[PDB]
Design a protein around this ligand. Sequence first.
Ligand code: X5A
Ligand code: K
Ligand code: K
Ligand code: NA
Ligand code: ZN
Length: 638
Amino acid sequence: AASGSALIFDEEMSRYKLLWTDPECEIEVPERLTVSYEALRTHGLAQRCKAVPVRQATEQEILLAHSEEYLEAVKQTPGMNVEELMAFSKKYNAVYFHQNIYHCAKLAAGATLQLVDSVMKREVRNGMALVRPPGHHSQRSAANGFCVFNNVAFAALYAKKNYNLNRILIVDWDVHHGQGIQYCFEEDPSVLYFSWHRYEHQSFWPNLPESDYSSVGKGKGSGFNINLPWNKVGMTNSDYLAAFFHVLLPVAYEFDPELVIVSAGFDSAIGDPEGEMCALPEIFAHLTHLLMPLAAGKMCVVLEGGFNLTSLGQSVCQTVHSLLGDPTPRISGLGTACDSALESIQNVRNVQSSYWSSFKHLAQSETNIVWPEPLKRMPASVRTVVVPPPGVELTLPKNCQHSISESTAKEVQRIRDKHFHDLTDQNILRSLGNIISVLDRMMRSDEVCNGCVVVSDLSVSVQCALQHALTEPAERVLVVYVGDGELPVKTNDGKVFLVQICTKEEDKCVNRLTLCLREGESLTAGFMQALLGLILPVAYEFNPALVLGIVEETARLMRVWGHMTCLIQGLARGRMLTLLQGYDKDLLELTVSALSGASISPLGPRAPKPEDVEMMEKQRQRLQERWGLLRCTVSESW
Ligand SMILES: CC(=O)NCCCCN
Ligand SMILES: [K+]
Ligand SMILES: [K+]
Ligand code: NA
Ligand SMILES: [Zn+2]
């Protein structure tokens, strides 16, 4: 199984720049690359990546996406003087040429292809290419918007040709529309393109009618182009995460790509002069994290734009941190998307409702500048500690470890002699020492991040885990419970949110999300739909300090548990304690595997039950006034 993250970079791509006055182009500078790599070096991230050399894209590789006439014309720019380079540049929109830019464009393209090969040959899990010039605006026969050749379009076409891939997802979180990518694949259903972008009702460059939400692709490609226009500046973390939970992710997990390519422009970050958005660099840690369960983690991140040298370095670092599996930073202050974003979100969901299962219920009435410096991120010495039943030894990943001090044993006796007088079952009393011992390593030590304990008696286990977390203190605790019945969990004072997956149904508490999913073959689609559209929005807004997972022994869990514990590690810096009632070798191994940051096997294929969709939207109705990140329509004003 693949391990490690590639970092592809070369100083040569910094050796072309603008040679005449042009305020439109002067923001695209060599230092974008140098500042980004040096930021990775400063924080020790570059040294943890597998360096892979750049190469030149060949002529034949360039012809995958560009015309012979355009290549031939660009191939002549190395021989041009300054006056001739200016005249050549003025044939195109917002792009400049330089004696060395043709060379650098072939390197940017070759670097991208190197990244695709390293990931697809399983030599690395994932990676990032820091390249200049950017690519996503370039077109079959035109340079455009600082881009000469379309690096990310190359990558998808190359992955199709050489690895026979049938489904590729391109995520373009740059603040500009990648119209070159859209045109490239607009008729191709094998490539799903998603783009958000500053649009302002077509008044923002590149001012194209087809960058609007109504361009869904053409022909056999209808539905595989998703545009989410931002019609006001100042979009925040909440807007970006609402886009992901309510548009991108439901479509991505349904599509089930075999490879993910990110057009990663960080001009969507606070401080950027082109974007004027307000999302913090930390959000890219989560945008990366939320996509990593796709395609068994095979993700190729390719630099596009980003022009505030400081937000640029910090957002690059947050992305590589997540590629390396480091714990995600906590995002505070999340809430409803703004009205203009909710309007863009409802509009794209409505037009896409003809093509995607997650949105299908919408089609019928019956169903319907300064910001703080990012904190340090670093992997735990031992990421995951495990406490199997006594005697059971397992083959653990190299970053896991098996489980009991005297300090702890006195605490268990104190807890026993106060709250469980009649308790003598020394197997339960063992698990209490394990829970307290594991939690203390999780909360106190930076050396342990999360853990999993097998228990026998849920009530005493859950009470001791929760109460020990709440007095540490962990300001807030998110409980995720798979099972029926009521637990010793009080959700009245706002310190606990309880997500419960059951079979019965329910309650009026707004600190509680109960999901009664009908048994059958459609539960996997239903669970994933609840996870992305309900569980994750609430969990993100709640912002817990610890996540407590609980699985009843009586409980189609194996198919989705791994996706949940991977995605839920976006909360609480990955600090999750899972209690498994009873020994199940497979469930315990999958839990440890996902907690430790291993790749998750893809879901494959379908469509969920209408009764389940109805049940889920009733929950959204009931909760979205308190938890606004749940909202995916504009609220009705009085
Ligand atoms: C790569 C990129 O972000 N290009 C933006 C072009 C701006 C034109 N005003
Ligand atoms: K974009
Ligand atoms: K397409
Ligand atoms: Na110009
Ligand atoms: Zn851009």
